[PDB]
Design a protein around this ligand. Structure first.
Ligand SMILES: *[C@@H]1O[C@H](CO)[C@@H](O[C@@H]2O[C@H](CO)[C@@H](O[C@@H]3O[C@H](CO)[C@@H](O)[C@H](O)[C@@H]3O)[C@H](O)[C@H]2NC(C)=O)[C@H](O)[C@H]1NC(C)=O
Ligand SMILES: *[C@@H]1O[C@H](CO)[C@@H](O[C@@H]2O[C@H](CO)[C@@H](O[C@@H]3O[C@H](CO)[C@@H](O)[C@H](O)[C@@H]3O)[C@H](O)[C@H]2NC(C)=O)[C@H](O)[C@H]1NC(C)=O
Ligand SMILES: *[C@@H]1O[C@H](CO)[C@@H](O[C@@H]2O[C@H](CO)[C@@H](O)[C@H](O)[C@H]2NC(C)=O)[C@H](O)[C@H]1NC(C)=O
Ligand SMILES: CC(=O)N[C@@H]1[C@@H](O)[C@H](O)[C@@H](CO)O[C@H]1O
Ligand SMILES: CC(=O)N[C@@H]1[C@@H](O)[C@H](O)[C@@H](CO)O[C@H]1O
Ligand SMILES: *[C@@H]1O[C@H](CO)[C@@H](O)[C@H](O)[C@H]1NC(C)=O
Ligand SMILES: *[C@@H]1O[C@H](CO)[C@@H](O)[C@H](O)[C@H]1NC(C)=O
Ligand SMILES: *[C@H]1O[C@H](CO)[C@@H](O)[C@H](O)[C@H]1NC(C)=O
Lengths: 612, 48
């Protein structure tokens, strides 16, 4: 093994002309033995040399071979496909439609060393020229869990097909000649083998850490490692980054710890490589996260709002010479958390416009702005579905900046509307524009709020004028919730207070925290209700925990390990070198270190704990 | 740039175009030369 290439994820996307595409495949896979990602071989034409693929031994992702006209794909030493990523929700190997208007193409796919697809299933569809693959026993390649998940179809009546060699297992091969007979290392085997084998007999058993077969009995005799190859041994997991500190009874920094690079364990991340909280070296972070350097090594961390997307806004940029959000408009604002400019909602949206050839927008689509969190210009809403009792699409709007203001006075304006309540429960800053709430003959709560707490420039005023009277709502019984503070309401619900009279639970205003009787049990800190940790055993009619985390339970649900409450006693964890930490539980449920001469684990104290 | 109905309903970027494989019943992109990935979203790392 060695030599590592990144892999591709183009699925069926095509890169330039067929030549362009061939040249990419080439430069990606040229002299590569281990594919960290996936291998997608598609669009390759007649008489294009795919000789370079003779070199590939391990593929980590999946293998996609589709839409080719090549007679021959020489994946001749492909040993394992790990299926760490599936194609089309389930296949680690999909070999789909490799023909052209003629019924020819892939005849030959001589995968004589493919012995294990570790995860995922296998699909073959529409290869009217593919030979011999017909015959394979997938029961030996594919693991039983994905056996009932295959789509298998080879539909030629006759062809350029040589029979297999007489020297073949139940008639299965990948092509012509003895070299192509399927080598079986799991079917034919032995009650005694809990894994793979070198042959029909018990002494032939491969170590459990081997993936495709072995050259002997050891963990250094594997053809391929099932999980990790650390130096020249196969292991279950890389030496941990975190290790167990007997003095803190929790996980500390492990100086002998190794990161994880494909199925390899490395001392450090290569080229330009970020790290994950699986402890892996990778080329780039996932979509639901994106981080920078956090003490030396670049780590990947979570955006816990959907990652910041800066979006134009009505008037400027790509949305220039547009009056408002439209049917034609509103898609272009999907994952957008901030508006670099204004937001207009005008009657023409919900009525539609003959001039600009714009259908009326569907009022359900307004939900696309649930993500918007900052408007930099101003927000102007002069129409709004009457069916909608709320400005709820802006539920999560945190800031309006007013850097530009309507007619040069207004940062927020809510005008001539049917709503009952301003839905703006996340609003906390309107820095530099005036506010206008007008003609909303049903809008009831706008007074309760102290707009002055929201201003950032000391000259901005309000105009809660020409809505309902204070008398009207009060009489309709449309006041703040009894659980809000003088501070106000963005509506009737408890979720809708600016701040709480008594206690907050996460987001809602509430009476009691769940001190003596709640769902999960709680404590209070800064008049908030915070959950007890799941290892605190609930105490009847008494307090259940005394803070955050596991050393704040009055009583552990399961086991005690130093000051921690734990679900299970430490069982084979990495330690401050020479060994794995192993404890048993005493009748008090206290964890205590097993006798050092164990190594297998124990069931009690001393040597009588581990038997032979 | 052009709206393209893939698994994750994105857009082909960097001047690329949407296409349809009729055989499968699946959409994909036709990237301009020198760009990689399903939605053409990445500079080739060598081709520049
Ligand atoms: C609703 O939103 C859509 C999307 O913005 C608006 O369509 C856009 O309308 C404008 C103005 O009619 C078009 O731009 C114009 O281009 C000409 C080039 O001849 C230029 O001289 C003008 O200054 C102007 O910028 C634009 O093509 C068009 N875009 C699309 C994709 O339709 C629509 O106007 C909005 N309608 C309402 C009622 O708000
Ligand atoms: C851009 O907007 C789209 C459309 O609203 C968002 O699509 C979202 O895709 C994610 C997939 O990661 C969905 O997350 C969920 O994950 C959980 C946990 O595995 C799973 O149980 C759910 O079934 C779901 O897949 C998210 O709900 C989904 N939104 C919709 C409308 O279904 C996407 O969040 C946005 N893209 C980015 C990168 O912000
Ligand atoms: C809540 O906690 C206190 C323990 O600190 C309990 O009061 C004790 O109860 C036992 C009765 O078995 C007495 O021997 C102690 O004298 C009490 N301690 C004190 C300081 O009063 C109380 O019982 C607990 N409540 C419940 C429902 O168990
Ligand atoms: C077109 C291409 O990149 N092919 C390369 C070739 O240039 C190089 O000499 C060889 C080294 O073994 O690897 C292959
Ligand atoms: C939330 C709200 O105001 N509900 C109203 C209700 O008062 C009335 O019965 C009806 C006709 O006006 O429309 C709805
Ligand atoms: C020594 O601790 C290291 C920490 O990296 C760990 O990986 C290893 O398992 C420990 N030694 C042995 C052979 O148990
Ligand atoms: C709720 O609020 C009032 C303060 O206005 C307070 O007297 C009371 O203790 C709080 N909690 C309960 C148990 O009602
Ligand atoms: C508009 O809002 C009013 C007042 O809350 C409501 O009674 C009415 O049903 C709404 N109109 C329509 C057409 O939905």
């Amino acid at each position: 093994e060695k030599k590592v290439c990144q892999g591709t994820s183009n699925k069926l996307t095509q890169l330039g002309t067929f030549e362009d595409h061939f040249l990419s495949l080439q430069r990606m896979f040229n002299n590569c033995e281990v594919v960290l990602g996936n291998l997608e071989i598609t669009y390759v034409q007649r008489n294009y040399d795919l000789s370079f693929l003779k070199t590939i031994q391990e593929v980590a992702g999946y293998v996609l071979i589709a839409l080719n006209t090549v007679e021959r794909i020489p994946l001749e030493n492909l040993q394992i496909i790990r299926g760490n990523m599936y194609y089309e929700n389930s296949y680690a190997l999909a070999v789909l439609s490799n023909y052209d208007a003629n019924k020819t193409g892939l005849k030959e796919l001589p995968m004589r060393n493919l012995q294990e697809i570790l995860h995922g299933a296998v699909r073959f569809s529409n290869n009217p020229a593919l030979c011999n693959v017909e015959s394979i026993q997938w029961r030996d390649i594919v693991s039983s869990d994905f056996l009932s998940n295959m789509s298998m179809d080879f539909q030629n009546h006759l062809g350029s097909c040589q029979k297999c060699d007489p020297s073949c297992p139940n008639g299965s091969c990948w092509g012509a000649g003895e070299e192509n007979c399927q080598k079986l290392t799991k079917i034919i085997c032995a009650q005694q083998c809990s894994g793979r084998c070198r042959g029909k007999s018990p002494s032939d058993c491969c170590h459990n850490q081997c993936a495709a077969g072995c050259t002997g009995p050891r963990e250094s005799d594997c053809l391929v490692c099932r999980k990790f190859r650390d130096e020249a041994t196969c292991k279950d997991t890389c030496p941990p980054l975190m290790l167990y500190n007997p003095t803190t009874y929790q996980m500390d920094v492990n100086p002998e710890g190794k990161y994880s690079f494909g199925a390899t364990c490395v001392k450090k991340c290569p080229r330009n490589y970020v790290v994950t909280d699986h402890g892996s070296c990778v080329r780039a972070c996932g979509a639901d996260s994106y981080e920078m350097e956090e003490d030396g090594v670049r780590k990947c961390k979570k955006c816990e709002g959907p990652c910041r997307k800066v979006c134009n806004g009505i008037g400027i940029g790509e949305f220039k010479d547009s009056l408002s959000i439209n049917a034609t408009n509103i898609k272009h604002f999907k994952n957008c958390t901030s508006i670099s400019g204004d937001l207009h909602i005008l009657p023409v949206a919900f009525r539609g416009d003959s001039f600009t050839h714009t259908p009326p927008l569907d009022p359900q689509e307004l939900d696309i702005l649930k993500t918007v969190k900052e408007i930099t210009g101003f927000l102007l809403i002069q129409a709004w579905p009457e069916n909608r009792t709320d400005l709820h699409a802006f539920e999560n709007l945190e800031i309006i900046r007013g850097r530009t203001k309507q007619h040069g006075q207004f940062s927020l304006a809510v005008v001539s509307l049917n709503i009952t309540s301003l839905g703006l429960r996340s609003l906390k800053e309107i820095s530099d524009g005036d506010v206008i709430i007008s003609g909303n003959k049903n809008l009831c709560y706008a007074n309760t709020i102290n707009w002055k707490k929201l201003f950032g420039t000391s000259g901005q005023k309000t105009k809660i004028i020409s809505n309902r009277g204070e008398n009207s709502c009060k009489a309709t019984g449309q006041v703040c919730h009894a659980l809000c503070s003088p501070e106000g309401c963005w509506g009737p619900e408890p979720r809708d207070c600016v701040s709480c009279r008594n206690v907050s639970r996460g987001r809602e205003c509430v009476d009691k925290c769940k001190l003596l009787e709640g769902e999960p049990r709680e404590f209070v800190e800064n008049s908030e209700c915070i959950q007890c940790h799941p290892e605190c055993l609930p105490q009847a009619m008494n307090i259940t925990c005394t803070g955050r985390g596991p050393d704040n339970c009055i009583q552990c649900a399961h086991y005690i390990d130093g000051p921690h409450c734990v679900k299970t006693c430490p069982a084979g964890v990495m330690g401050e070198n020479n060994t794995l930490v192993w404890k048993y539980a005493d009748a008090g449920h206290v964890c205590h270190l097993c006798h050092p001469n164990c190594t297998y684990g124990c069931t009690g104290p001393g040597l009588e704990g581990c038997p032979t | 740039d052009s709206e393209c109905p893939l698994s994750h309903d994105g857009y082909c970027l960097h001047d690329g175009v949407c296409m349809y494989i009729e055989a499968l019943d699946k959409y994909a992109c036709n990237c301009v030369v020198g760009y990689i990935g399903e939605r053409c979203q990445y500079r080739d790392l060598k081709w520049w």
